[PDB]
Amino acid sequence: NFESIISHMNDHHKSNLVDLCKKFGGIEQVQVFLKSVDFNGLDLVYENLRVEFPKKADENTIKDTIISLCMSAKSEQNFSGVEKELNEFMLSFNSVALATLNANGEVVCSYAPFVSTQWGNYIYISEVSEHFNNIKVNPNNIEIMFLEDESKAASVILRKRLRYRVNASFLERGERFDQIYDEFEKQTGGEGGIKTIRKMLDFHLVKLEFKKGRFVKGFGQAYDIENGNVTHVGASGNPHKFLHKH
Ligand code: HEM
Numbered sequence: 001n002f003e004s005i006i007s008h009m010n011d012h013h014k015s016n017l018v019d020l021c022k023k024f025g026g027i028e029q030v031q032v033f034l035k036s037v038d039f040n041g042l043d044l045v046y047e048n049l050r051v052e053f054p055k056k057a058d059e060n061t062i063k064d065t066i067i068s069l070c071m072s073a074k075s076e077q078n079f080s081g082v083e084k085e086l087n088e089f090m091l092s093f094n095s096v097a098l099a100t101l102n103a104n105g106e107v108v109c110s111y112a113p114f115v116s117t118q119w120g121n122y123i124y125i126s127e128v129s130e131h132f133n134n135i136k137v138n139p140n141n142i143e144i145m146f147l148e149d150e151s152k153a154a155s156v157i158l159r160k161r162l163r164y165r166v167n168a169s170f171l172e173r174g175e176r177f178d179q180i181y182d183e184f185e186k187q188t189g190g191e192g193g194i195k196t197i198r199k200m201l202d203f204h205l206v207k208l209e210f211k212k213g214r215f216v217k218g219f220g221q222a223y224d225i226e227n228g229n230v231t232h233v234g235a236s237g238n239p240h241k242f243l244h245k246h
Contacts, residue, residue, distance in 0.1 A: 001059075002036070002037045002038075002062075005037065005063065005066065006034050006035075006036070006037060009034045009066075010033050010034050013070075014032050014033060014034075016070045016073070016074070017032040017033065017034060017044060018030075018032055019070070019073040019074055019075060020032075020044070020051060020069075020070065020073045021044070021046050021049055022073075022238070023073045023220055023238055024049060024051045024052075024073070025046070025049045025242060025244065026238050026240065026241075026242050026244070027046060027049075027244075028237075030046040030047075032044060032045065032046050033045060037062075037066070039053075039056050039057050039058060039062065040052060040053055040056055040057075041053045042066070042069075051069070053065050053069065054068075054069075054154040054155065054158060054218060054219065055154040055155065072218060072219065072220055072221060073220070075235070077223075077232040080230050082215070082217070082223060082230060083230055085217065086162060086213075086215050086223075086225070086230075089146060089148075089160065089162055089215075090116065090146055090162060091116065093114065093146050094113060094114055094115060094184070094187055094188045095111055095112065095113050095114055096111065096112060096114040096123065096144045096145065096146055097109070097110075097111050097144065097145040097146075097147055098110045098111060098112055098123075098131055098142065098143075098144055098145075099142065099143045099144070099145075100130075100131045100134035100135055100138065100141075100142055101134055101138045101141050101142075102130070102133065102134045102137065102138075103133065103134075103137050108130050108131055108134055110129065110130065110131040112124065112125050112131070113184070114144075115180065115183060115184040115187060117179075117180055117183045118183075119176060119179065119180060119207075120207050120208075120209075121207065121208045121209075121210065122171070122180055122184075122205050122206060122207055122208065123205070123206050123208060124181075124184070124197070124203055124204070124205055124206075125203065125204060125206060126197075126200065126202045126203045126204075127202045127204075128202060132204075135168050135206065136170075139167065139168045139169070140166075140167045140168070142165070142166045142167075142168055142208075143163060143164065143165050143166065144163065144164055144166055144208065145161055145162065145163045146161065146162040146163075147159055147160075147161050148160040148161065154218075158218060158219065160216060160217050160218075161215070161216050162213065162214070162215050163213065163214045163215075164208075164210045164211060164212070164213045164214075164225075165210075165211040165212050166208040166209055166210060166211060167208070167209035167211065168206045168207065168208055168209070169206065169207045169209070170204055170205075170206055170207075171204070171205040171206070171207055173205075177205060180205060181198055181205070212224070212225065212226060213225030213226070220234070220238070222234060
């Protein structure tokens with residue numbers, strides 16, 4: 001079963017088993033081979049290093065999980081096909097998590113419906129909610145998070161996420177409201193009481209202005225955003241601290 005890849009990995013690219021020790025062990029210098037694999041990860045030697053898989057594989061997937069485990073350990077960010085992946089990610093949602101602050105400096109964690117359009121990014125919120133006055137009062141101390149669903153994530157310790165600091169502006173109704181909200185209805189498909197809250201006057205559309213961003217798509221895969229300024233963290237070394245000690 002596995003001995004065919006154990007062979008192939010050991011007779012070709014231990015150069016990638018080398019990048020592997022340096023990132024799942026932190027080992028800044030050695031001079032490697034593969035001794036066993038299973039459906040939860042690898043066992044290798046530089047000297048035992050146990051390297052886990054983001055998600056448990058099976059006979060059909062195991063070949064690919066290992067190449068993915070290797071390409072991420074590669075010390076070179078790929079194309080900003082991460083810019084493309086970041087935006088594909090944002091567009092899969094029509095709701096977002098919010099961090100807001102009230103009149104007396106207490107922080108609030110809430111969520112709000114969200115839509116990206118030609119005219120910009122909006123949320124739709126009611127004055128009945130705490131985060132409303134937190135935004136009327138502190139309109140540029142907000143951060144929003146697009147957080148991957150737990151049931152879709154590799155594990156609860158690796159939910160993909162996209163975070164922006166934002167600047168919020170209140171729109172009023174009429175011309176654009178109907179433009180934005182009809183696009184919101186387009187993306188969401190319309191139903192669920194979405195039509196009903198459109199006609200609630202205690203609800204408002206708020207334009208969000210994205211500032212500094214942060215995207216995490218996997219272990220060792222955190223990126224920053226500014227002004228086309230995608231950026232891996234990160235190259236100044238593995239920031240974590242292992243014992244290498246039992
Ligand atoms: C065994 C490999 C790794 C594992 C299992 C791992 C796991 C994690 C986890 C669970 C977090 C979230 C911590 C939190 O939210 O409090 C995190 C954060 C982070 N890690 Fe790693 N990591 C690994 C390797 C690396 C490497 C190689 C780098 C640098 C290239 C790195 C850089 C970072 C950065 C920059 C963050 C902050 C992300 C954020 O703002 O949420 N990690 N890591």
